[PDB]
Ligand binder design. Structure first.
Ligand SMILES: Nc1ncnc2c1ncn2[C@@H]1O[C@H](COP(=O)(O)OP(=O)(O)O)[C@@H](O)[C@H]1O
Lengths: 65, 441
């Protein structure tokens, strides 16, 4: 009862999380999937407190305790 | 560095106009010949058309009247697009194979197939490599790279970590991971990690970081002839044969099936056929067994246009005993179309010597140029074009700057032109071995 939800085990196609385009590579500083160099520019000069909100929208933010 | 000044290093194309086909008299090296260069221009413009078979144009003319010059002009006026193949006609008489088949390969070498397909490559400096070989093995690892713009982390398969320790990718290399295969071509070394390289030479080149995105698609264009495909489909690993000549008699059913699949590639739009040019230099050195095959290899759809050059007048045909014009049989002279050249007027001789002097960068006084034109009137272009290179060096003996009459008259004194050499043979009969006799003083 209520433990019939099931996870998966399959390769996931990872998309961008700034835009919705398919994105093939992430970052070391902020760990954001991104499409091209314009989105990389907007990632590396975004004001602080939002680079964590993108991972909040995607999930696995892991905020401090 | 492998650009040593040859006897044709001054020709930079055919030199004619491409709008009204007018042979302007001095451009790109070819100077003086007008009617023959216009006919070669017409032939050149119907080569790039492609809507003609393999036809035959015979550049007939006297010695040293610019026949290899016109052929090299047509070679330079096509670029590396339409396959030009030189063939001096004594490479055919081999022993690895027969003679007619050696001619057939030279026909098949000049019909290119041009296909264009894409690849996915990666530029960029490696920031760092971590490989989890801990007893473990090549199982997982992280690769952090960057361009000037991008920066990225990738995880690697086992058959990529086995290519990373194969090329030994350091922290700072400029690599090109071809994604579809897995080969790694290190384009160079990054400058910013010049301290981090100890096992290198003292003089070592260093590049900059690649500019632009890190994942891009290239539209490379390959062009291989039908002889390439024939030699590939002949053994187990047979492409080495066309680098070592060890190919033998290729069976004709392979050539027929490849002539079928090239047509099936053309009709599906996957390919495109480019007819090339085959230049048979000194075509009089073929026997009639060759002409009885060139008369029928110039019949098929897949046949390159043959350009060929003959010196001889009424001479004998090899293999047989009966004479003929240009050393060619008459049933083959029905096929060919002949361009005749002419000897050179002395002002054209003077400006050809001027171009050959400016090519080697040798300074000349106009008096020495007048004397050299006077010599070339009586001894041909080749003798004067060698007297230029001799006279520069003789002027460099006594530490001079410009050559003069006092050095052309020394080069004319030491090195005999062939007319005076024939006179020397005729006046020194009894000691030179004619056929039988040797007299010793
Ligand atoms: N129109 C020309 N312009 C410049 N150089 C020429 C021209 N015609 C002939 N030559 C020169 O004359 C020499 C003889 O030409 P080439 O075609 O080799 O003679 P052959 O026809 O006997 O082989 C070549 O070295 C070439 O440099």
């Amino acid at each position: 009862t209520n433990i019939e939800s099931a996870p998966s085990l399959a390769p996931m196609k990872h998309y961008c999380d700034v835009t919705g385009l398919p994105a093939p590579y992430l970052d070391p500083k902020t760990r954001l999937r991104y499409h091209n160099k314009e989105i990389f520019a907007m990632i590396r000069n975004l004001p602080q407190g939002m680079g964590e909100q993108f991972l909040e929208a995607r999930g696995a933010h892991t905020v401090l305790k | 560095g492998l650009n040593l000044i040859a006897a044709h290093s001054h020709i930079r194309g055919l030199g004619v106009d491409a709008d009204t086909l007018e042979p302007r008299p001095s451009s790109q090296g070819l100077v003086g010949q007008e009617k023959a260069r216009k006919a070669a221009a017409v032939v050149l413009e119907m080569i790039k058309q492609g809507k003609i078979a393999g036809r035959a144009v015979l550049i007939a003319g006297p010695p040293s009247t610019g026949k290899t010059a016109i052929a090299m002009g047509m070679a330079q006026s096509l670029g590396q697009d339409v396959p030009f193949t030189t063939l001096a006609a004594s490479e055919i008489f081999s022993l690895e194979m027969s003679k007619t088949e050696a001619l057939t390969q030279a026909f098949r070498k000049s019909i290119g197939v041009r296909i264009k397909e894409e690849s996915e490559i990666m530029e960029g400096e490696v920031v760092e490599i971590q490989i989890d070989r801990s007893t473990g093995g090549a199982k997982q690892g992280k690769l952090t790279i960057k361009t000037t713009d991008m920066e990225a982390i990738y995880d690697m398969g086992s058959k990529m970590i086995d290519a990373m320790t194969k090329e030994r990718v350091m922290a700072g290399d400029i690599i090109s991971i071809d994604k579809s295969s897995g080969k790694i071509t290190k384009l160079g070394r990054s400058y910013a990690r010049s301290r981090d390289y100890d096992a290198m030479g003292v003089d070592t080149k260093f590049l900059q970081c690649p500019e632009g995105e890190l994942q891009k698609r290239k539209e490379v264009v390959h062009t291989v002839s039908l002889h390439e495909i024939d030699v590939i489909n002949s053994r187990t690993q047979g492409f080495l044969a066309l680098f070592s000549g060890d190919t033998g008699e290729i069976r004709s059913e392979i050539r027929d099936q490849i002539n079928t699949k090239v047509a099936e590639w053309k009709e599906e739009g996957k390919a495109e056929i480019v007819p090339g040019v085959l230049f048979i230099d000194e075509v009089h050195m073929l026997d009639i067994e060759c002409f009885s095959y060139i008369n029928r290899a110039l019949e098929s759809d897949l046949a390159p246009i043959v350009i060929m050059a003959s010196n001889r007048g009424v001479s004998r045909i090899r293999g047989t005993d009966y004479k003929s014009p240009h050393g060619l049989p008459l049933d083959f002279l029905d096929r060919v179309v002949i361009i005749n050249t002419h000897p050179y007027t002395p002002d054209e001789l003077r400006q050809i010597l001027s171009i050959r002097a400016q090519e080697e960068e040798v300074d000349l006084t106009p008096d020495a140029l007048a004397l050299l034109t006077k010599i070339g009137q009586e001894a041909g272009l080749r003798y004067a074009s060698n007297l230029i290179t001799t006279s520069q060096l003789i002027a460099a003996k006594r530490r001079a700057k410009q050559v003069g009459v006092e050095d052309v008259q020394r080069s004319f004194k030491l090195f005999y032109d062939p007319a005076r050499s024939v006179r020397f043979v005729q006046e020194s009969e009894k000691r030179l071995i004619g056929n039988d006799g040797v007299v010793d003083f």
